[PDB]
């Protein structure tokens, strides 16, 4: 597997739920990204550098993706839901003397980070979130049109080992399906090779891809009833927050991102960049200066 | 291998312009088909056709695609596994066999073709039986968080190919098996005589016949929908008197109350519902064969 991240250095840091790998560069205040699915941390690898001109970058992999440790999963998927895995992230932080960090998420990670922000928003100093809208709103906006888009968050939340055992015939398949699916041009081209390597590579095991199923039955589930507690009480991200989609991203099939957006938090700019859902490596140098720019000032 | 569970019914292969629809045929009487549905063929009916078979000439039918009926060449719009198509193949069949006024009970998706049949050519029909459906406009519209979940393979099997084909290759026995099992009310196989298990198994191997079933789960999201929009919008109501069946844990009143739905597609229904989960006529024969001949006969 390529290094990605010249000059990063590489941080495996102890958490009480495992260790997050990360790749770290950079100096200046602390600023953590956080990739999706099905990626790992390399999907910063275009927009890092940029960043890590102005800023302490920490490119972590989430719990249970990547080479981050996976912690056990339970019937209530606890490690993987969103609230978890901020609480995982603010300890892999604090291990670094991080206390109060920006945060750019994109995917699942965007999950993590707006959930992090509405459980600890005194650990943010300011968020992003690129192409999504929160869990509760994808559930609550899926209708027949939205089920077919994102039918992998019905499918991958089915009971294990059914989605396992699907992914198990041919797991090279669904990864590479799934990143040529959401892109712009619905191939690969907009990846790096290697950066689709690194993908494949966590996608081939089989403990990752039940780890990914485990993030997703947290989305149908408990990710879903922690939003929908904060948005039946009106309970909104106070932390400044960009956020990004793509022209041609998941988010904004779903609705106008920055109106559902505004309804969440009380401080929130937004801009669509031209791209499919995979901002950082199919548009990254509009993700980067956008970046750039929101934690910059 | 495959057992014979129909002793003393005919094999019938029928010609249609379409392809070969294979069927079991037995008894004497007026004609009453049946139709299966997904994940089986015919073959679900063993339980049930002895007994119906004592007062009518029943058919059990594979559908067009499925079990050892011939599989159409879909296309782009999966014409040929639209429920209109289907019906409109069965019409024909049941005319070669000269039935041109007959009985029809269908089950999932062969319940689908039925009030389809019903809708395009009710003449056709003297009574229908739907069992364990809803049809498929109001799951669609009905689609929620909830729904989404619990029929998530309505959006799975309808990906574009080769996405569904090449899951299912993954592990077919245990899908096959899977959704057997997790939508009878025992949650596993013992509801079903293994000796059918083994023809929905052996049916499901094929990949081919795979396909056909992603072809009409994508008929059931598209032109299916659309064709049941239009009897909607146009107030279109079954005339036919039907029986509405469904399993009190099944697949249609998890969504919506189904007699009261019923009601709104069709102008003379009655409802009950029957001790089981969706397969009504395994997992509840005696119940399901009961309501079946006292509504036919």
Redesign the interface.
Same mark, same amino acid.
């Given at each position: 597997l390529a290094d990605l991240f010249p000059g990063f250095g590489s941080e495996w840091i102890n958490t009480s739920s495992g260790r997050i790998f990360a790749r770290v560069g950079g100096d200046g205040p602390p600023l953590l990204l956080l990739h999706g699915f099905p990626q790992t941390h390399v999907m910063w690898h275009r927009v890092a550098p940029k960043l890590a001109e102005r800023f302490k970058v920490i490119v972590a992999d989430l719990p249970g993706y990547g080479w981050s440790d996976m912690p056990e999963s339970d019937e209530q998927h606890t490690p993987y839901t969103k609230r978890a895995m901020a609480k995982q992230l603010i300890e892999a932080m604090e291990q670094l003397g991080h206390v109060h960090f920006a945060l750019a998420g994109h995917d699942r990670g965007a999950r993590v980070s707006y959930r992090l922000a509405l459980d600890s928003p005194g650990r943010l100093s300011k968020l992003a979130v690129l192409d999504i809208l929160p869990t509760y709103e994808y *559930?609550?906006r899926?209708?027949?049109a939205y089920? &077919?888009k994102i039918?992998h *968050?019905?499918?991958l939340?089915?009971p294990a080992? &059914?989605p396992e055992?699907?992914?198990?015939?041919?797991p090279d398949?669904?990864v590479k399906?799934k990143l040529a699916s959401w892109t712009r041009a619905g191939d690969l081209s907009a990846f790096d090779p290697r950066a689709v390597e690194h993908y494949r590579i966590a996608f081939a095991d089989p403990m990752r891809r039940h780890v990914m199923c485990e993030d997703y039955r947290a989305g149908?589930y408990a990710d879903?009833e922690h939003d929908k507690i904060d948005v039946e009480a009106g309970n909104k991200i106070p932390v400044p927050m960009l956020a990004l989609w793509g022209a041609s991203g998941i988010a904004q099939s779903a609705a106008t991102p920055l109106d559902v957006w505004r309804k969440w938090a009380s401080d929130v700019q937004g801009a669509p960049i031209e791209s499919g859902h995979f901002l950082p490596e199919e548009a990254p140098d509009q993700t980067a200066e956008a970046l750039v720019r929101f934690f910059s000032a």
């Open positions: *559930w609550q899926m209708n027949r089920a &077919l039918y *968050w019905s499918f939340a089915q080992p &059914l055992n699907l992914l198990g015939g041919d398949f669904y399906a149908a879903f």
